[PDB]
Design a protein around this ligand. Structure first.
Ligand SMILES: CSC[C@H]1O[C@@H](n2cnc3c(N)ncnc32)[C@H](O)[C@@H]1O
Ligand SMILES: CSC[C@H]1O[C@@H](n2cnc3c(N)ncnc32)[C@H](O)[C@@H]1O
Lengths: 161, 152
């Protein structure tokens, strides 16, 4: 833990939300809405399954994209190469090795989520510590935007507490 | 455990949101209440698809009106009304087995008269956004309650 005065001169405290190759624009939009709500960076790792001009990314009566700290990466490789030295990345999977709620999040952690249809590839999962959102019911996975919100807000709870 | 709260959607408008919520309800093993009128037919393929193959595992309750919902509310039961204008943070609540979590329609949220009736909870949004997506808000609220009750 940092000294109190060091913490003071650090910014509002924040994690990075990262979508690996999102396919469905409504999912990306519903994640962006969460990112802008928290004031946290949203990283989109191409290829995306949609054009950024898609009418499906917004909603009438809503405007959040102008307030999204959007980061675009051309590939997963380029994303990794762009990480600061010592970056901590948590890969989210319903087959994850530890519970989300066991994790102790820190400033500038990266929370990494897969596409709705397939999730993160096994090689990516094997590369990072993996976190599971518990599902006591007979369900294989949650909707992407829901999983991002549950994870992001648990980190928010931890950080602001 | 096991643990059980109730998830309640007041006049949900978009079938994809209701199906996503059904998926979350099935994942937690919690009943899902819908209060009519809905913005979609219950026969909707988009609704069904949004819940994938999980609808068989959803304890689905339908109410013809808000009044009907209230009459189905056991004496002493607690309701939390979720609102972006809510009075207390989600994380200040201490949830209990059997609590009802109430959410409003995507396009306008819960009526003022409904907000006035129950304690209101806000999911913090320090950034400039007016509100979260309905299914995301339900997930965030439901899983904070799950975290509290499972002791982690
Ligand atoms: C296959 S669902 C799309 C993405 O949502 C995330 N996700 C969905 N459900 C869960 C869950 N129970 N636990 C952890 N991550 C999840 C995962 O990052 C997945 O790649
Ligand atoms: C108007 S968005 C649809 C519903 O989502 C819920 N909701 C969306 N964002 C929040 C938020 N920050 N806090 C509490 N509830 C929210 C509210 O119940 C609302 O009626």
């Amino acid at each position: 833990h940092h000294h109190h005065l060091e913490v003071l001169f650090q910014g509002p405290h924040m994690l990075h939300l990262v979508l690996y190759q999102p396919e469905i624009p409504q999912n990306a939009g519903n994640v962006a809405r969460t990112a802008a709500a928290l004031g946290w960076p949203l990283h989109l790792i191409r290829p995306l399954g949609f054009l950024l001009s898609s009418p499906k990314l917004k909603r009438a009566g809503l405007d959040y994209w102008p307030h999204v700290d959007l980061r675009l990466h051309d590939s997963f490789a380029a994303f990794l190469e762009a990480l600061p030295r010592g970056a901590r990345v948590f890969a989210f999977s319903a087959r994850g090795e530890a519970s989300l709620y066991e994790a102790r999040f820190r400033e500038g952690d990266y929370l990494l989520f897969g596409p709705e249809s397939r999730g993160l590839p096994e090689e990516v999962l094997a590369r990072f510590p993996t976190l599971k959102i518990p599902m006591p019911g007979p369900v294989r996975s949650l909707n992407l935007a829901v999983a991002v919100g549950v994870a992001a807000y648990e980190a928010y709870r931890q950080l602001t507490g």
